[PDB]
Design a protein around this ligand. Structure first.
Ligand SMILES: CCCCC/C=C\C\C=C/C=C\C=C/[C@@H](SC[C@H](NC(=O)CC[C@H](N)C(=O)O)C(=O)NCC(=O)O)[C@@H](O)CCCC(=O)O
Length: 1332
């Protein structure tokens, strides 16, 4: 009377036995709350949130828990008033009920608004009660009424448990306040999604993070663990175990998900067996159908809990890594600073942290993928037998083959990356010197130079396309690669074996499962190798030696005290300052004096605890303001540069700004002091950078100032003014202890104390007059001296219509072939079993041929698609480059250089890497979903009525997801860049920050910048889970209906038709979610194509008109004639009617604001003539093509910008002039001695802008360019080597006509026929003799 099959599996009324009802159905819920409870105290204790108040809901639940216990014990009372189960079961139920009410009580105490255990437990109890209820109502007072009361109370308790209790910024994330049901299905983001449909998302209306995802909590925890280990020993992975306890729930969730996923094919086997057998009740089939849907729903909920936990752990890992690296960068010693690069360190933060999030999502595969394949193997084995091994051998041949590919893809990126940077380093060199480049027609040469690098880069992309082809091939047809071999061996080995519907289709479903773990595991292994590579970098960085923090005694308010102190720049390097001793009293001006490399700047570095103190005692008293030699400028506005995170005082600020003589600099700058100075914003001259640095130090109002050569780049008058109003005894810092490093004698007599040193050693310090009287070292020193479809059509044109249509045809052929192969397997399964099947050889051969066609087609579209991607990228980059180069300088000056150089990099990276792969994934998923839907209706046509409900809801999520995700996927991208770009700045001014003691402010700044990025990132990773849960639920509904419609119509179809319909239904779930994701990725990445075709409407005079082309000797004499010239800019140039005769030296004089320089722009047609007819000799300029005239006229600009490469490519990019001409021109440019000195001869590799070369040399190289050009018309733009360049321009260019715009009248006096420009008009036209 406990368990039989007659009343439970062979009867049309599926009733449970009486004993089963009273034993197992009651042991399930009571025992469910018994194994988790002891484990629930762990969570309830470790995690606390206060206590919830006394509410009616909490009490209602507690009172019903008391009554429920009574009712269950009331049964024991009546039993006490024969059957053994009538004693233990009621008491056990009462006791577990007493545990339930105690649990809601303690959950109130521990502050859990919504409970998961107190919901699943009631759900399980309800289902058990429902089963007994149905049985008890089918049986029909004494003990039944107690059960009805129990069931009603349990139902009301379950309904109550759904509501969220009262709680223990104006925009907190609803993560914490959401109930259990909302947390399971991620419903709390729905509003944020739906708002994303009408109200465009902004960084302000974004949620704030939780307390578990903020830098202030995640970073100090990892820092403490890192400190504990170092002192304990310093290994690293040991520390990452801290994330383990949280990451541990991922283990349980993945373990549950694996079994839940494998419960699918078993139910499919049961269903196929049911359809095969005629003598079976319909309720049996309905049971399997409902069980499959329940299993799928539990699987998806568990999987998306696992994924969310895994993603949150990775985000925390990134946050902790960023925080730890930033906090360490402020403490590492000098040698460690130089051990890396301000560049590599930033790249370490940018790459290692991202790799950790990238790894986290699939690190669990190392233990899950093996189980997800091994368990399938055993299921396949018991289904088929030994023939499985012959299949798995192919699986063996798949892992290494797939791994080597993942090995190649790992390395090819490197060969691509170094090729990309080499391009992007060159493009800036083009963009910085665009005017000089387009002054004498270097557009083509540099275009070809860039295109060569582009081709070298595209070779690697072609190789990566060939690799990704095999990768996709394996991913797509690994299931069938296994299936064909396994079925062939199974049929061939033995004649007696019969392949029915259940074997073939359950094995096919199992292979569909095997597909994922097989092809993800090598990718996980490669990612682990990369992460372990990055771990070594993080180890060697975090383990760096921090500089002694107490080396310098910083006593709060004899001002500076040094006795017998020797300092080093490294532990093993020799001392730089040997045995220094000096006492600087309060409010005294001390000047450090020495030669180059003496040790002056080292003294100020040592007073800031930047040098490594090998011995001594330093007692700097009070706050220190450091003015470094190399000025550190924050990208913030000039006002905040001077303020330096300090309260603004209008009177003090306005006293500081002009005392540094920053008023003219404020005037020239556009926005004044609100202008964005720094590398990214407006560039500033060195002297201006010094003034701002000094102004910042003066505003900081310290007592001790360390001025490491503040007046190096300021002019003599500006320097004297600054010293008078700032550093001098009658300036701003009169009472401040100033210690200045100088090599200028002009202010030395005003200094109170002069510390003169030699070779890092104190050498007879003293006051100026006393030192002069002593006549020693100081005397010697003094004596020394919604995307539109048009974008998609444009991209498909860029690929090429033939390639695009061929790729589309090959997908259709691949997917039709796969569908036909599966249908053929379905026909094979249900064949006359005439003892076995006789079509075996024929059907096996046909199935093999279809699969070979499938594989050949798959490798086909990828190759076409992948090659089409390369073709489109090549054409897009070429078009962009041609449009930019042909564009006038007005674009360059109007559009920011940063925005333009963004597309030359990010857009090309997107088109080169992301777009083709996303198209492949999107179209593969779309065709798989369409094919599965097609098969569903082929097997069950009545499933068409299920389309409208799903097709509506699928329409909504698809409409709600992409409209919102594109915002977040953008909001994150624009927010992660300010993080690293901040760190770089912090890395440039570590010494300044430590001197001002502003570590904490920058720590908070970095924490805030990381938190903003996380705020942008977390909603996206929750939107992924939201979308996936919705679409997986849709897929589970479609599997439910597809199985149900086969069950109801099992007398018209075959288990094979069922086997195929349900098997494809199981595939629909994992493909709908990826289809919508890939639609989102397409709608986000295809905008890059629009950004690339933006400059399509490139606009300058067509080069080489070839219709009015001039003769070879166009400047026959060089007769220039400005005939009523007017230059628009309202008119800078106006009423210009001048004539410069051939071979007549002519200069242009004028003040700032005149049309002097603009006149040169007129000669080279930089700006089109608003009204003018400039004619050289007998030919109009406006008619001639640009290149022609730009080649026949030469210019020596203000600052010659030398381009990266060899000197010969600088002189002659086209290599048109012979080597003898280059040598002669270089000799004639007073450069033969220097140019012969480089070991590379003419191939000297000059860096960006010729940093290695001096300014004089670069000027002479530009003169050499002009001389090598050998043209009759030459223009000069004048600002030490002036004597040399002036003599050289006066030496052999007397034959040629030279215009000269000089800000100095001394040189212009030599040139006859001076033209003076007052405000664009010709004020005077005649020789300098007539001028005076
Ligand atoms: C892509 C292969 C090359 C191209 C092949 C051509 C066409 C293939 C057809 C369909 C494409 C996609 C199929 C399934 C997704 S499936 C998405 C993936 N897997 C799961 O959803 C986990 C479920 C799985 N069954 C398991 O074992 O847990 C995942 O981790 N999602 C995380 C998230 O939600 O963000 C995988 O591609 C994701 C892996 C992508 C990757 O890391 O390269």
């Amino acid at each position: 009377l406990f368990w039989e099959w007659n009343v439970t599996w062979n009867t049309s009324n599926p009733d449970f036995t009486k004993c089963f009802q009273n034993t197992v159905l009651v042991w399930v819920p009571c025992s469910y709350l018994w194994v988790c409870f002891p484990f629930y105290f762990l969570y309830l204790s470790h995690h606390d949130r206060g206590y919830i108040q006394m509410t009616h809901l909490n009490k209602a639940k507690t009172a019903l828990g008391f009554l429920l216990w009574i009712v269950c014990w009331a049964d024991l009372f009546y039993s006490f008033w024969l059957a053994p189960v009538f004693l233990v079961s009621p008491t056990l139920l009462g006791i577990t009920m007493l545990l339930a009410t105690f649990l809601i009580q303690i959950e109130r105490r521990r502050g859990v608004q919504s409970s998961g255990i107190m919901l699943t437990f009631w759900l399980i109890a309800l289902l058990c009660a429902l089963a007994i209820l149905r049985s008890k109502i089918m049986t029909a007072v004494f003990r039944d009424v107690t059960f009805y009361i129990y069931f009603s109370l349990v139902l009301i308790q379950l309904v109550l448990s759904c509501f969220s209790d009262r709680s223990p910024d104006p925009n907190p994330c609803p993560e914490s306040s959401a109930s259990f049901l909302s947390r399971i299905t991620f419903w709390w983001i729905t509003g944020m999604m739906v708002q994303g449909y009408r109200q465009p998302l902004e960084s302000t209306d974004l949620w704030s993070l939780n307390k578990e995802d903020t830098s202030e909590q995640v970073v100090p925890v990892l820092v403490k663990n890192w400190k504990k280990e170092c002192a304990k020993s310093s290994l690293f992975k040991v520390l990452y175990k801290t994330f383990g306890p949280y990451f541990l729930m991922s283990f349980l969730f993945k373990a549950v998900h694996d079994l839940m996923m494998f419960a699918g094919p078993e139910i499919l086997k049961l269903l196929i067996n049911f359809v095969n057998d005629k003598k079976a009740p319909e309720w049996q089939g309905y049971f399997y159908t409902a069980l499959l849907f329940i299993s799928a729903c539990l699987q998806t909920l568990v999987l998306h809990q696992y994924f969310h936990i895994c993603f949150v752990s990775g985000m925390r890992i990134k946050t902790a890594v960023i925080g730890a690296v930033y906090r360490k960068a402020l403490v590492i010693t000098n040698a460690a600073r130089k051990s890396s690069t301000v560049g590599e360190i930033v790249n370490l933060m940018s790459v290692d942290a991202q790799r950790f999030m990238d790894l986290a999502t699939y690190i669990n595969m190392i233990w899950s993928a093996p189980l997800q394949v091994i368990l399938a193997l055993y299921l396949l084995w018991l289904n088929l037998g030994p023939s499985v091994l012959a299949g798995v051998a192919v699986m063996v041949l798949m892992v290494p083959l797939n791994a080597v590919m993942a090995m190649k893809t790992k390395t090819y990126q490197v060969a691509h990356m170094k090729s990309k940077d080499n391009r992007i380093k060159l493009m800036n060199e083009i963009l910085n010197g665009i005017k000089v480049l387009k002054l004498y027609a270097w557009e083509l040469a540099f275009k070809d130079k860039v295109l060569a690098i582009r081709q070298e880069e595209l070779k690697v992309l072609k190789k990566s396309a060939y690799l990704a082809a095999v990768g996709t091939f394996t991913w797509v047809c690994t299931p069938f690669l296994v299936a064909l071999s396994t079925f062939a061996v199974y049929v061939t080995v033995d004649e007696n074996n019969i392949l029915d519907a259940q074997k073939a289709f359950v094995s096919l479903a199992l292979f569909n499962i095997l597909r994922f773990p097989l092809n993800i595991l090598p990718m996980v292994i490669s990612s682990i190798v990369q992460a372990s590579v990055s771990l070594k970098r993080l180890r060697v960085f975090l383990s760096h030696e921090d500089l002694d923090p107490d080396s310098i005694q910083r006593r709060p308010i004899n001002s500076i005290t040094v006795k017998n102190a020797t300092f080093t720049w490294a532990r093993n390097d020799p001392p730089t300052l040997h045995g220094i001793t000096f006492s600087v009293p309060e409010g005294s001006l001390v000047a450090v004096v020495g030669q180059v490399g003496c040790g002056k700047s080292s003294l100020l570095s040592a007073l800031l605890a930047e040098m490594d103190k090998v011995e001594g005692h330093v007692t700097v008293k009070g706050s220190v303001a450091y003015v470094p030699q190399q000025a550190w400028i924050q990208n913030i506005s000039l006002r905040e540069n001077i303020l330096f995170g300090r309260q603004l005082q209008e009177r003090y600020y306005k006293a500081v700004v002009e005392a540094c003589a920053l008023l003219p600099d404020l005037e020239i700058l556009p926005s004044g002091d609100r202008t964005e100075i720094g590398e990214k914003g407006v560039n500033l001259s060195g002297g201006q950078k010094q003034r701002v640095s000094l102004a910042r130090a003066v505003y900081c109002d310290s007592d001790v100032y360390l001025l490491d050569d503040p007046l190096s780049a300021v002019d003599a008058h500006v320097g004297k003014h600054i010293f008078e109003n700032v550093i001098g005894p009658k300036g701003l810092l009169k009472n401040k202890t100033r210690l200045l490093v100088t090599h200028a004698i002009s202010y030395l007599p005003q200094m109170d104390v002069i510390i003169v040193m030699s070779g890092g050693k104190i050498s007879e310090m003293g006051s100026y007059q006393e030192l002069l009287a002593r006549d020693g070292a100081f005397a010697e020193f003094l004596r020394t001296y919604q995307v539109k479809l048009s974008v998609y059509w444009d991209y498909m044109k860029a690929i090429g219509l033939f390639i695009s249509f061929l790729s589309i045809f090959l997908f259709l052929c691949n997917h039709v072939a796969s569908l036909v192969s599966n249908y053929w397997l379905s026909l094979w399964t249900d064949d006359p079993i005439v003892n076995t099947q006789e079509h075996t050889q024929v059907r096996l051969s046909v199935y093999g041929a279809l699969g070979i066609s499938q594989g050949i087609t798959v490798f086909g579209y990828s190759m076409a698609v992948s090659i089409g991607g390369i073709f489109a990228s090549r054409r897009l980059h070429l078009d962009l480059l041609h449009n930019v180069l042909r564009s006038p300088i007005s674009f360059f000056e109007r559009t920011p250089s940063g925005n333009l150089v963004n597309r030359f990099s990010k857009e090309l990276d997107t088109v080169d890497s992301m777009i083709p792969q996303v198209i492949k994934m999107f179209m593969g998923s779309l065709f798989n979903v369409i094919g599965a839907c097609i098969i569903i209706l082929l097997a069950t046509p009545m499933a068409a009525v299920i389309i409208p409900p799903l097709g509506l809801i699928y329409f909504f999520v698809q409409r709600f997801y992409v409209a919102s995700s594109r915002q977040l996927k953008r909001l994150e991208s624009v927010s992660r860049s300010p993080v690293y770009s901040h760190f770089n700045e912090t890395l440039l001014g570590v010494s300044v920050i430590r001197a001002f003691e502003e570590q904490e402010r920058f720590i908070r700044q970095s924490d805030l910048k990381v938190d903003e990025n996380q705020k942008a990132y977390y909603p996206s990773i929750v939107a992924n889970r939201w979308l996936a849960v919705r679409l997986e639920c849709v897929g589970n509904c479609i599997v439910l209906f597809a199985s149900l419609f086969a069950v109801i119509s099992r007398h018209s179809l075959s288990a094979g038709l069922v086997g195929l319909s349900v098997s494809y239904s199981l595939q629909v779930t994992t493909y709908l979610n990826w289809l919508v994701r890939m639609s989102s990725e397409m709608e986000t990445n295809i905008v890059a194509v629009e950004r690339l075709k933006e400059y399509s409407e490139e606009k300058e005079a067509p080069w080489q008109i070839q219709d009015m082309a001039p003769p070879k000797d166009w400047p026959q004499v060089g007769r220039v004639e400005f005939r009523d010239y007017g230059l628009r800019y309202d008119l800078v140039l106006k009423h210009i009617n001048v004539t410069i005769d051939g071979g007549e030296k002519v200069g242009i004089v004028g003040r700032t604001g005149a049309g002097k320089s603009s006149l040169t722009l007129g000669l080279f047609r930089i700006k089109e003539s608003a009204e003018g007819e400039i004619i050289i000799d007998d030919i109009n300029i406006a008619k001639i093509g640009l290149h022609d005239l730009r080649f026949k006229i030469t210019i020596i600009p203000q600052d010659p910008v030398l381009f990266s490469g060899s000197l010969r490519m600088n002189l002659d990019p086209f290599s048109q002039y012979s080597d003898e001409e280059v040598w002669t021109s270089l000799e004639l440019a007073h450069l033969k001695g220097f140019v012969s000195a480089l070991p590379d001869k003419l191939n000297h590799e000059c860096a960006e802008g010729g940093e290695n070369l001096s300014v004089g040399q670069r000027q002479l190289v530009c003169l050499a360019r002009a001389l090598l050009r050998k043209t009759k018309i030459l223009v000069l733009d004048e600002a030490e080597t002036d004597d040399l360049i002036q003599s050289t321009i006066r030496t052999q260019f007397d034959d040629c006509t030279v215009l000269t715009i000089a800000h100095r009248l001394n040189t212009i006096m030599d040139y006859t026929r001076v033209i003076v420009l007052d405000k664009g008009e010709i004020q005077e036209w005649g020789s300098p003799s007539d001028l005076l």
